[PDB]
Design a protein around this ligand. Structure first.
Ligand code: FMN
Ligand code: FMN
Ligand code: CA
Ligand code: CA
Lengths: 502, 518
């Protein structure tokens, strides 16, 4: 290196200079004091190692930040039933951070209200809305899309898809237009969250002609839109969702992400889109360490979820938040999902401080083993009635009927619990604590452990914005440390990691 | 920020040339954003003609991982190929890796002592100065056997053991460690017998990071097995030099996320190292999920001293696995693995990670656990379900299987047969375990006609590998050499570090150059 200097061997000061990512670091050894650092040099103590000013903006894909209009290559993933609440979106968006409104499970009127509120607060973004695939209820998907289009909601996080549907195709294609120069403008942005290559492929490739044609025919998109749709991917960003809270197939981040990046390279080479497809990732990200790891694999951006439910902005009860602050990595497990209960799908939930997973598991065993509720041995039937429902199955069924084969009846009854248990947690239903269904992964325990001993120990002091900052600033910090280490600098262990001190 | 300038015609804008130069890790890279032709790159600069807008130093694989790991183990990369049972991590594998300066752990688990001794002799002939290791697997039921292995290792001066499946210390692993301790000419401690402990739980890591306890040491001294000075020395050095954090992986696993497990173990390391202040610090590396350069890089950059591979090595021509298996393994995609009942600890619900494409083992094994748990006894299994097992799985009556098992365990370990009845559950388990046991052997040896029952250990790392490799010469199983894979992961990781660097400076690197490809 070409520099020399004439500052500093003061350990506390070493920490301060290292942590200022807005300034370059010039490193000196000598003897003693034996590692020194300066923030200015000149083209006579020469310089042994260097780190440039590289901050949070240096992580991830700059195009992600440009396209979404955000300060970080980060987003807070949707959380069902308004858990990713209006307050959450607004707080994050006010900070220049992307967040997906948790539309899943909410009624249309509720979603409309959220749109209005969010748009009032964030007239020029950033924000996204969750569009969840609803296999059983196509009309509902159509409805959400119409709403989004009606209000010019420009960004959607598409999740739980098994491939394309006419509704997501419609959203995508309806946003396309030509600029003065004749180039395609992609007005409706899509972030497709996936865990399989088969589905990723569908979103990385253009929409099919036949679906497009029907949309033209139905008067939903224009001929040119149909044409344009054939030359742009179905999503701008692909979120690889590894092992995570909620619905998940438990794939390792370190294998999923690389696999999807491989796929990306393949598709990009084949289509040569003018704007390259981006691949980001989530699932397991609760620390600076994990955040950096994910960027380091080639993630365009990172996604958090579990840690955000723990924050004061989230639509989750005080009880629940409090409990989330104590939840360790061993305190989560797989349990039956209300959605696709019948096929045995499971989701990752909290199992300490609640009996939900045991109870859900019981409902599945019973559902699968009996023909009808009548076949359930008056025996365990009565314990269910006592411990789970707190009312005869018949009475549950009556309520259900007012909310409007025997196997189907049994499911409908059981889904009362599977469904309401999530609501109970979200709203804080008193006396129903032991039945709270609370979605979370190992990310949360990771976070908690990382934060132990800090101000973050108090659930009341957890703000989504702050968490984002820690992950991003921490990652950036640790990137600098790696750079110096790579060069043979002896950074003291106590400075090697970003910890929450303030 | 950059104090150099560069004369044109040293610069290229050529994309073929960009790639070549980026990939040359022995030379630094000076980048310039020219009005045109845009991105340029040179490998020499002035110091005052265009100014430099981005830089990457010459930094190669040696900057990855812990240099002490390399010095201590006498290897050229901070990497090791993990043990694979029943000789899957074969003599051929160990030799090929060791000959290249790459650490490999011989798969001694399940092999008989004479076989292990033969292995030792062959390996030591080929590698008189290393590097190599031997797997010492904990056998909770069978301390005499663990004892024999250590005895064999000490006899032949096998200096490096990969200690796996431990739940804590045992007198055998302690003996191994302590017996290797000597003084140098200055009186300093020499750690002759190196130990790499592979763990997934903090409770176990802790034991291996701390010194051997007084009580066991004292015992060894009393038995005449180690000297008093060796006992003294043992109190100042860790039980293991290296701790491998094993995340989600092929074979036995508790499916821990690498991105949460490794930082947890590193933090523990820091704590213990700070407490004991060992002259040579304890190190933590990691495996589980490492099948690509991206993953390798991220792992190093989390703080791993080294990386460990396992699933990908089984796929290589040196592995002690059948040609059929190896060929299969090249077809395995990331979702083509699943958890299945383990033969070892079947009854306790222990599972392991196996291939589920091109073999029905997992489906069949899972069915067995289902049946075992559901029914009181073999006689209670619905006639037609039991029939389908006999046709499709056992290829014989359950009573014929039982017959063989009795005969077998009566010559080997009659305790099982005794214990197992009156108690139909245990008898049923014993019968089912016949399949769980042999299915591995079938794969390893390539039993003809038992292809759909092959038990083949593997995690998603293999799938990621296959995806990474797709379209390359590596598509052909016959072209997969362990050394080559190691080198690809190491060099690729180095390459990606440079790419990341440059990207972080805002350099527009073409998508096709962002990842290291075969
Ligand atoms: C309580 C909770 C609710 C969630 N709800 C949704 C949802 O409705 N739709 C969706 O696509 N993802 C949902 N997610 C997934 C997150 O958006 C994110 O992808 C995931 O949580 C990241 O993994 P992590 O849990 O390891 O952080 C939810 C996650 C949690 C923890
Ligand atoms: C087929 C196979 C056999 C293995 N046998 C052993 C063994 O006998 N002892 C052991 O400690 N680890 C064993 N392992 C684990 C590997 O040594 C290594 O730790 C692990 O495979 C790395 O994770 P990965 O599968 O994601 O690469 C085995 C792994 C595989 C795939
Ligand atoms: Ca999820
Ligand atoms: Ca394993």
């Amino acid at each position: 290196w070409p520099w020399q200097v004439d500052i500093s061997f003061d350990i506390e000061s070493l920490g301060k200079k290292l942590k200022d990512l807005n300034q370059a670091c010039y490193l000196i050894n000598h003897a003693e004091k034996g590692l020194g650092i300066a923030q200015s040099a000149e083209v006579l103590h020469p310089v042994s190692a260097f780190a440039p000013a590289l901050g949070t903006q240096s992580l991830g894909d700059s195009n992600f930040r440009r396209v979404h209009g955000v300060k970080y290559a980060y987003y807070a993933g949707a959380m069902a039933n308004g858990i990713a609440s209006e307050e959450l979106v607004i707080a994050l968006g006010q900070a220049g951070i992307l967040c997906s409104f948790g539309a899943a499970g909410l009624i249309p009127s509720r979603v409309e209200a959220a749109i209005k509120r969010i748009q009032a607060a964030l007239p020029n973004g950033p924000y996204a809305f969750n569009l969840i695939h609803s296999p059983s209820e196509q009309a509902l998907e159509r409805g959400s899309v119409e709403l989004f289009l009606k209000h010019q909601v420009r960004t959607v996080e598409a999740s739980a898809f098994l491939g394309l549907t006419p509704q997501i195709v419609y959203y995508r294609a309806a946003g396309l237009s030509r600029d003065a120069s004749g180039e395609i403008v992609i007005g409706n942005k899509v972030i497709a969250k996936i865990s399989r290559t088969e589905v990723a492929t569908k979103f990385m490739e253009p929409a099919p002609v036949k679906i497009l044609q029907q949309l033209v025919n139905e008067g939903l998109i224009s001929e040119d839109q149909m044409l344009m749709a054939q030359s742009v991917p179905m999503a701008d960003d692909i979120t690889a969702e590894a092992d995570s809270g909620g619905h998940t197939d438990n794939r390792p981040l370190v294998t999923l992400l690389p696999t999807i990046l491989a796929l990306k390279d393949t598709i990009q080479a084949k289509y040569q889109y003018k704007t390259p497809i981006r691949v980001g990732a989530g699932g397991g990200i609760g620390t600076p360490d994990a955040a950096l790891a994910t960027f380091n694999m080639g993630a365009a951006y990172i996604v958090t979820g579990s840690i955000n439910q723990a924050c004061v902005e989230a639509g989750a009860s005080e009880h629940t938040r409090k409990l989330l602050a104590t939840t360790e990595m061993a305190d989560v497990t797989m349990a039956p999902a209300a959605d696709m209960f019948e096929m045995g799908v499971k989701l990752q939930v909290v199992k300490r401080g609640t009996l939900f997973p045991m109870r859900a598991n019981k409902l599945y065993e019973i559902y699968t083993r009996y023909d009808s509720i009548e076949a359930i041995p008056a025996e365990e039937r009565q314990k269910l009635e006592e411990q789970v429902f707190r009312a005869s199955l018949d009475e549950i069924w009556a309520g259900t009927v007012a909310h409007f084969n025997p196997k189907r009846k049994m499911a409908l009854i059981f889904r009362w619990y599977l469904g309401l248990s999530s609501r109970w947690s979200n709203t804080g239903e008193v006396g129903r604590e032991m039945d709270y269904q609370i979605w979370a992964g190992p990310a949360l325990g990771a976070f908690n452990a990382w934060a132990k001993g800090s101000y973050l120990d108090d659930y009341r002091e957890r703000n989504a914005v702050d968490l984002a900052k820690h992950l991003m600033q921490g990652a950036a910090y640790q990137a600098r440390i790696n750079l110096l280490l790579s060069q043979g600098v002896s950074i003291p262990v106590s400075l090697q990691r970003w910890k929450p001190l303030q």
